[PDB]
Design an enzyme around this catalytic site. Structure first.
Site, PDB file in Angstrom:
ATOM      1  N   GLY A  57      13.518  15.135 -72.638  1.00 49.60           N
ATOM      2  CA  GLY A  57      12.565  14.302 -73.511  1.00 49.60           C
ATOM      3  C   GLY A  57      11.304  14.883 -73.516  1.00 49.60           C
ATOM      4  O   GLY A  57      10.484  14.307 -74.309  1.00 49.60           O
TER       5      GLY A  57
ATOM      6  N   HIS B 226      13.864  22.270 -83.147  1.00 51.52           N
ATOM      7  CA  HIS B 226      15.209  21.822 -82.697  1.00 51.52           C
ATOM      8  C   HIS B 226      15.269  20.444 -82.822  1.00 51.52           C
ATOM      9  O   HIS B 226      16.549  19.980 -82.268  1.00 51.52           O
ATOM     10  CB  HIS B 226      15.583  22.507 -81.307  1.00 51.52           C
ATOM     11  CG  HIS B 226      14.833  21.956 -80.088  1.00 51.52           C
ATOM     12  ND1 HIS B 226      15.075  20.829 -79.692  1.00 51.52           N
ATOM     13  CD2 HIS B 226      14.082  22.806 -79.299  1.00 51.52           C
ATOM     14  CE1 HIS B 226      14.251  20.766 -78.576  1.00 51.52           C
ATOM     15  NE2 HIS B 226      13.457  21.994 -78.260  1.00 51.52           N
TER      16      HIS B 226
ATOM     17  N   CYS C  31      10.296  17.634 -74.378  1.00 51.19           N
ATOM     18  CA  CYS C  31      10.165  18.556 -75.468  1.00 51.19           C
ATOM     19  C   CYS C  31       9.069  18.528 -76.481  1.00 51.19           C
ATOM     20  O   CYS C  31       8.867  17.144 -76.707  1.00 51.19           O
ATOM     21  CB  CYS C  31      11.263  19.040 -76.232  1.00 51.19           C
ATOM     22  SG  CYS C  31      12.673  19.723 -75.277  1.00 51.19           S
TER      23      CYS C  31
END
Ligand SMILES: CO[C@@]1(C(=O)Nc2cncc3cc(F)ccc23)CCOc2ccc(Cl)cc21
Ligand SMILES: [Cl-]
Lengths: 302, 297
Positions: free
Chosen positions: A143, A41, A145
């Site tokens: 952030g 993503h 991820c």
């Protein structure tokens, strides 16, 4: 003596954390040898998230669209491929700090350490469990991820989790390092809900054996139970069914303390019925389920 | 979202852990530059025991490499072994002494090998509720500030109640403890009030408000109540330190104190706060701000 929720030392994982930037999105990557692994993503916009066609978004990207930063050094991307929900970025430099590692997919009830990172920089480490509904009760801000979950056995790092999303209730969903999600989740901004969570029964039993090993026996009783009667009572409190596998796994702890698994099960039935009456077990007023039988043996026996 | 007991990343400290052996005793050492720091009980009259020893009596192991001792000196309850090789993995560091209520990460080690990392607080009674087994002596406590590691604790002993006692890196004990086998006990402990209040603000930030009420209190009335429940007195300094969290949530410190008074007098009534049925006191106001904001190292 003492019993704490202990995470594995994070050093071997710290030396693998990099920052991945695609357009306006910045998240974390795992740099192992000449490949950087991160959530796919990173190629999406907030609009794309509703119904993303990842294949169509990826075909429009070139190598130089991906910016990878390891400390204050920019790594050059020389290739890219997708494997399920992870993006694999081929880089021109192999990570000299690559530890001995393996990718493992864990089952619900299993624990692991999480190195929470932001902008390729590690900020903290904590110990987690894969819940029966496949979510993790973590601590993640925007952030984070691409932050990873792992265990260390001997000199080998077993990577088992990569962070991808936060669900509406505050719990977290992610994939193994091959990009397969744990649970019925998708990397799409769909109306997704965790599922009713249950207590990891085998882990609560292990934690009760850890209290007996540390000298606490106030909760024991003179009763036993059949496995079936225990499960009929356990389900009424939203506890996971205890299987014959779980009874087998608790064998070493049963042999060490002298308390049969089914007798410890009778004690758990009574704790569920009575509560603690102002008492604690290993400094806790709730029944702890984020320590596996293996964690108990590791932290207590040596 | 989420609120966990988070430790600092341990990597900078892992690269300093060594094994120290003298005679039949094996424990952990901290290798910074060309000096290895470890508890002096590895060798009572410690200057009389130390004067007998020579450099070659101390075996120091860094991984599978033997470091040769070229000098030795004592500083309070810490033994400093001069080694031939400077640690190439020495981070930017400082030795700091912490106060009760402050928190830190502990890298638990056995035979110069780190096995786990956990977060903990220096109790008002100067003990730490750690998780240590035989061979853990010399394990260290630290905080990380930017790229600087502040070493604040070195493990020395376990007390009969299962709690732990140790020194700063200059060898001065925290608490009225001595490095000697004698009748030593942990004193009556108290709850770190400023930390419970910070944890209540962290609960509000994460969406838990059931404990809030319309009431406010005076600092004096709150302290009369807090003293009854073995809570540490709350000072004006504590109120000042909680200012940023009060500004962020819109709940005045004495407004949150009135909520804490009701939890002490009435309990949780079958409810929990941040997944806990007890009032948590091992998160400082700074830990709450750092975790609910996102500071990296
Ligand atoms: C792109 O990231 C999304 C996301 O869940 N992010 C987050 C991950 N972790 C922690 C978070 C904490 C926050 F306060 C905010 C966002 C978080 C944003 C929402 O839509 C989606 C939909 C699906 C997926 Cl797989 C990702 C996302
Ligand atoms: Cl597993």
């Amino acid at each position: 003596s003492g019993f704490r929720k202990m995470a594995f030392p994070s050093g071997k994982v710290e030396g693998c954390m990099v920052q991945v930037t695609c357009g306006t999105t910045t998240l974390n990557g795992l740099w192992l040898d000449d490949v950087v692994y991160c959530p796919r993503h990173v190629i999406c916009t907030s609009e794309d998230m509703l119904n993303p066609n990842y294949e169509d978004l990826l075909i429009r990207k070139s190598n130089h669209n991906f910016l990878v930063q390891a400390g204050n050094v920019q790594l050059r991307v020389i290739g890219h491929s997708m494997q399920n929900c992870v993006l694999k970025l081929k880089v021109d430099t192999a990570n000299p700090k690559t530890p001995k590692y393996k990718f493992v997919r864990i089952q619900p009830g299993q624990t692991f350490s999480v190195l929470a990172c932001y902008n390729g920089s590690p900020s903290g480490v904590y110990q987690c469990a894969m819940r029966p509904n496949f979510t993790i009760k973590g601590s993640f801000l925007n952030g984070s991820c691409g932050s990873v979950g792992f265990n260390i056995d001997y000199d080998c790092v077993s990577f088992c989790y990569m962070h991808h999303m936060e669900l509406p209730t505050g719990v977290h969903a992610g994939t193994d390092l091959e990009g397969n999600f744990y649970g019925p989740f998708v990397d799409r901004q769909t109306a997704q809900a965790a599922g009713t969570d249950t207590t990891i029964t085998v882990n609560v039993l292990a934690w009760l054996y850890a209290a007996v090993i540390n000298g606490d026996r106030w909760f024991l009783n003179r009763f036993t139970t059949t496995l079936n009667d225990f499960n009929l009572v356990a389900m009424k409190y939203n506890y996971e069914p205890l299987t014959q596998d779980h009874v087998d796994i608790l064998g070493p702890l049963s042999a060490q303390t002298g308390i049969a698994v089914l007798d410890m099960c009778a004690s758990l039935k009574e704790l569920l019925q009575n509560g603690m009456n102002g008492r604690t077990i290993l400094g806790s007023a709730l029944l702890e389920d984020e320590f596996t039988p293996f964690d108990v043996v590791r932290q207590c026996s040596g």
